[PDB]
Every structure is written in structure tokens, then in C-alpha cells.
């Protein structure tokens, strides 16, 4: 929701459309008068929107309102912010790669020695 | 008071008079058969402290156990496996000599009796000598008495053979309650089994 709000911050009254789910954010204190079309609203998010005196539109509704999508703004969530994506790319072992190794837990005993510090053979 | 005094005396052990007595007693034992009934406890106070009571069905038995490690039973000294398991001669038994003593008497000698307890008595370099307190679970004197009667139950057959006498409790490592004993508490084997147990769930 916070992200949505941020996005909407420039142009008002136009309708943000999100082709996914919208979740609420406890980190936000205020919610502006938002008109949002989504595939899914989490209940709490929906409630928040309602409170804001806003509007929750489903995709069909949006279509009905704006068959050419006039005055609409497409928004996406952060895709590569997913935990899976953190393991991808260059594998940990290749220099300067920022990928999370698949490990059991965290702490000293777990993948923090040889090849992770100058002091144990090599680093990274 | 008398019993306290004798306890105190027995604490000394190495003090001349006590020592002499011990020497005498061990000498006497060396002569007597390996298992032999005794007329009366030679350590009455000690017997009392354990399970002994002055009742008809209570018997004291004296038993001699050889000291030292137990050579690992094999044809010739050779072991036929990995080096880690190859040693003999310096292999120790998991049971106490006391436990062994109680076992041997309780078994083929006194199958009818029930081992209640056992105490130390005396030793030499060859043998440790124990007096074992036993009870007849069929004697009415024992059957009636609400204190003791428990031993009359069938669950107490050959306690000595299941490590349920004090000595058994010791070597089973039940004596030391605490974090020192986490691994063995309902029973070592039982505990191990529990730990192994993978619980799947019909639902899963």
C-alpha cells in the first residue's frame, strides 16, 4: 500500500491499476484518497482503503470504467526482491557475487570459513 | 546410638583396630565357599541402612567376586575385526563387582529368594566380598508386613538380573540425576529408541 501511495504521489484522481495482490503496510500512518484496481486486495488493505474514503475496483469494474484504460497507471510489485531471486545470478564462489548460498541455518558453524575469509584459504 | 557408633568405626577402616578386623574377616572368607549363607549380618547397622530387617524371611548371604578387568571372550587372544575393537585384557565390564556378586547369588543359588540389597564387607587383591540381603517372598512374615510386602510382587523377580538393585541403578547411571544423565533416564536403550523414533503423522 505504501508503495502504491508513493507512486500515486505525483498525479492524483487517476486510477492506479495493479495486476496482482495489494497488501497493507503498518508502516504507513496516513492513507490518501486512492482509487485502486487490483486482482486481489488483502482484507486489511481493503479496509484501509475504505477508511481513506477511497475506492477498491476489480478488473472487470476497471474495464467497464475505462475500456481504453484512460487515466490509468499500471504498477508492479518488486519482483527481484523475492527470496528465491537472492540465490540466483552468479553463484557464491564467483568473486563479487551477492547471492545467498543455500544453507541449513546461520552462524559460525555454517558456511563461514574456507573461502569466506582471507584467513581461511580464500574469500568469496 | 550404638548403630551410629559402629558406622563411625566403620568409616575409619584403615585405622588399626578396624583394619585388623577386616584382615581377619577376609581371611575367614577366603576359606568359606564362594557363596555361603551367613547366620547374621557381619555389618548389622549397614544391613539395616539398606533393606535388612529382623523378620523370619530375611536372609543374609556372603559372596566372593574376583577382582580385575574381564578378558574379552574369544578363541585365543585374537579379535577378528577392525583395530578399534582389537584390544582385550584392558576391557572393563559395565556392571559393578557388587552387581555381579548379587547376580550370581540371586540366580542359580537363590532363585526362590528375592535380592533386596547388598553391601561391601571386605576385600583382598584377589576377591571382593559382599554380604547380600535377600527376602523370601513366600514367607507370610513377609507377605503380611505392609512395609516390605512390595518385594512379594511378581514384578520383582530377579531384580538383580535387570540392574534394579542399588548396584544396577548405579551402573545404569540412574544414581546421578541431572544434566549429567540426560541420555539415560527411563532406560539408556529406551532413550536411544525414543530418539531414533521418526514420527510421521497420518495427516502429515
Amino acid at each position: 500500500l505504501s508503495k502504491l501511495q508513493y507512486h500515486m504521489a505525483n498525479h492524483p484522481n487517476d486510477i492506479a491499476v495493479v495486476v496482482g495482490s495489494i497488501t497493507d503496510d503498518k508502516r504507513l500512518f496516513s492513507l490518501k484518497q486512492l482509487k485502486v484496481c487490483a486482482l486481489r486486495f488483502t482484507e486489511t488493505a481493503r479496509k484501509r482503503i475504505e477508511d481513506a474514503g477511497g475506492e477498491c475496483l476489480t478488473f472487470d469494474q476497471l474495464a467497464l470504467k475505462y475500456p481504453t484504460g484512460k487515466k490509468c497507471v499500471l504498477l508492479r510489485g518488486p519482483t527481484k526482491a523475492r527470496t528465491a531471486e537472492k540465490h540466483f545470478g552468479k553463484a557464491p564462489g564467483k568473486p563479487k557475487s551477492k547471492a545467498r548460498p543455500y544453507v541449513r541455518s546461520k552462524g559460525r558453524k555454517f558456511e563461514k570459513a574456507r573461502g569466506r575469509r582471507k584467513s581461511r584459504a580464500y574469500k568469496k | 546410638g550404638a548403630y551410629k557408633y559402629i558406622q563411625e568405626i566403620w568409616k575409619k577402616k584403615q585405622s588399626d583396630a578396624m583394619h585388623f578386623l577386616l584382615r581377619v574377616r577376609t581371611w575367614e572368607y577366603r576359606q568359606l565357599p564362594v557363596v555361603h549363607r551367613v547366620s547374621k549380618p557381619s555389618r548389622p547397622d549397614k544391613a539395616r541402612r539398606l533393606g535388612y530387617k529382623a523378620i523370619q524371611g530375611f536372609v543374609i548371604y556372603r559372596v566372593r567376586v574376583r577382582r580385575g578387568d574381564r578378558k574379552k571372550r574369544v578363541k585365543k587372544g585374537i579379535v577378528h575385526g577392525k583395530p578399534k575393537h582389537q584390544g582385550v585384557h584392558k576391557q572393563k565390564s559395565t556392571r559393578n563387582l557388587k552387581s555381579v556378586a548379587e547376580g550370581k547369588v540371586g540366580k542359580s543359588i537363590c532363585g526362590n529368594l528375592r535380592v533386596l540389597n547388598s553391601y561391601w564387607v571386605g576385600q583382598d587383591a584377589v576377591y571382593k566380598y559382599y554380604e547380600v540381603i535377600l527376602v523370601d517372598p513366600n514367607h507370610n512374615a513377609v507377605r503380611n508386613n505392609p512395609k516390605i510386602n512390595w518385594i512379594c510382587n511378581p514384578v520383582h523377580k530377579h531384580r538383580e538380573l535387570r540392574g534394579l538393585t542399588s548396584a544396577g541403578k548405579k551402573y545404569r547411571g540412574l544414581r546421578v540425576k541431572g544434566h549429567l544423565s540426560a541420555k539415560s533416564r527411563p532406560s539408556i536403550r529406551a532413550n536411544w529408541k525414543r530418539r531414533q523414533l521418526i514420527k510421521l503423522r497420518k495427516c502429515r
Binding site: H87, A91, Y102, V103, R104 | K193, Q196, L197, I198, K199, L200, R201, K202, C203
Partner: protein, 211 residues
């Protein structure tokens, strides 16, 4: 091992198949247990199958805030209630010889609870009709009509369950009442720093006392 998968840590190198318990019996077992409980209740006509446990605070820095039922009431609490341990045992209450009180407030709470329980309870005479007063702690034996009335009413199990948290976590407070000067982090860190020396001092004090 191959590809980017987690390193295999499946402890199945022993004869594990020898010790697999599948709980096909779970629900049915539960049902059986329930039935047994019911039977027990029936046997103990009127009386509740559940025994009184005191509320107690959980150990460790992490469960400290929570309160749960402990087993047994402690002699002191029994005394406060105005009850003998044996008497308590005979009735609904669990007693704990080993438990000790270091919290006066806690003790008070426990005694209050005990009192409440006592108030709630009505005692059926040991021999019929013959109404006689209890021993040490046990209250009084009521008449027959009263007993009947009680029976007719539903036996509550509210006391045998632990009292849920008081709630707060949000309370209004005035802005003028706030203290703008209290570096809490600073205080913490200072405290941490000063620990060892404080401990030493305490030890010294103890030593002094011992003489």
C-alpha cells in the same frame, strides 16, 4: 552431491525403518481418551475430574512475562488460604512441598485464587445427611436441598483454567507528563559497563556480612 542444492543432512544412515511410528491411531486414540475421561467423571459423580493448579510465572528471560498453571500450591499459600496441606490434597487442590515464594504479590494472588476456589466449592458430607465441619482447612458440609440445587446448576470449570492476560499494551498519557531527558540506551550501556564492578562490590558486602 550436485547442482546448487542445500547440502544433504538427512540422518537416515541407521536402520531407521526398524523404528517408524505412523499415527493412524491419532484421532481414534484421542476419542478413546475422551471417553475414558467421561467415564472417570461419571464415576466421580458431581466432582470435577480436574485439580486446582496455582498460576505461576514462567522462568527464563523469554517467558517471564507469561503466566501459566504450575503444579502445586506451596505450604505458605495453603496457610494463607487457611488450609492444611493434607486437607487441600483430599479436596480439589494440588500442593507443592518443593515450590518456594520470593514474590509477595504472587503469593497474595495465589491465596486470593485459593479463597475464590473455596468460595465456589460446596462440600458433600462423608456420611450421608450428618452435616459436620471440616478439618483444619476444609469448609462446611451443607444440607441436602442446597446440594440438590447446586447439582441442578452447571458445574463450572472456569477456575481450573488459567486467567488470560490483563491486556494493556496501549494506554493514554499526557505530553506534559513525558520526560524529554532520559537517554535509555545510554543508561543501558552504562549499566552493562558497570556490571562486573557492581558484582564485585556485592560479593565484598556479602563477605563482610558473613563476619
Amino acid at each position: 552431491v550436485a547442482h546448487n542444492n542445500v547440502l544433504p543432512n538427512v540422518h537416515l544412515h541407521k536402520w531407521w525403518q526398524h523404528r517408524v511410528r505412523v499415527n493412524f491411531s491419532k484421532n481414534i486414540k484421542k476419542k478413546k481418551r475422551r471417553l475414558l475421561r467421561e467415564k472417570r467423571r461419571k464415576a466421580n459423580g458431581g466432582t470435577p475430574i480436574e485439580k486446582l493448579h496455582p498460576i505461576v510465572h514462567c522462568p527464563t528471560q523469554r517467558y517471564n512475562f507469561r503466566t501459566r498453571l504450575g503444579k502445586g500450591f506451596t505450604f505458605e499459600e495453603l496457610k494463607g488460604a487457611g488450609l492444611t496441606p493434607r486437607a487441600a490434597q483430599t479436596i480439589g487442590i494440588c500442593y507443592d512441598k518443593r515450590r518456594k515464594n520470593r514474590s509477595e504479590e504472587s503469593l497474595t494472588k495465589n491465596v486470593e485464587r485459593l479463597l475464590k476456589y473455596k468460595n465456589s466449592l460446596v462440600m458433600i458430607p462423608l456420611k450421608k445427611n450428618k452435616a459436620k465441619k471440616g478439618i483444619g482447612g476444609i469448609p462446611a458440609d451443607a444440607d441436602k436441598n442446597t446440594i440438590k440445587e447446586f447439582r441442578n446448576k452447571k458445574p463450572l470449570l472456569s477456575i481450573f483454567k488459567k486467567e488470560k492476560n490483563t491486556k494493556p499494551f496501549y494506554e493514554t498519557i499526557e505530553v506534559s507528563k513525558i520526560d524529554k531527558e532520559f537517554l535509555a540506551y545510554k543508561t543501558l550501556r552504562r549499566a552493562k559497563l558497570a556490571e562486573r564492578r557492581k558484582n564485585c562490590r556485592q560479593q565484598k558486602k556479602d563477605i563482610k556480612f558473613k563476619s
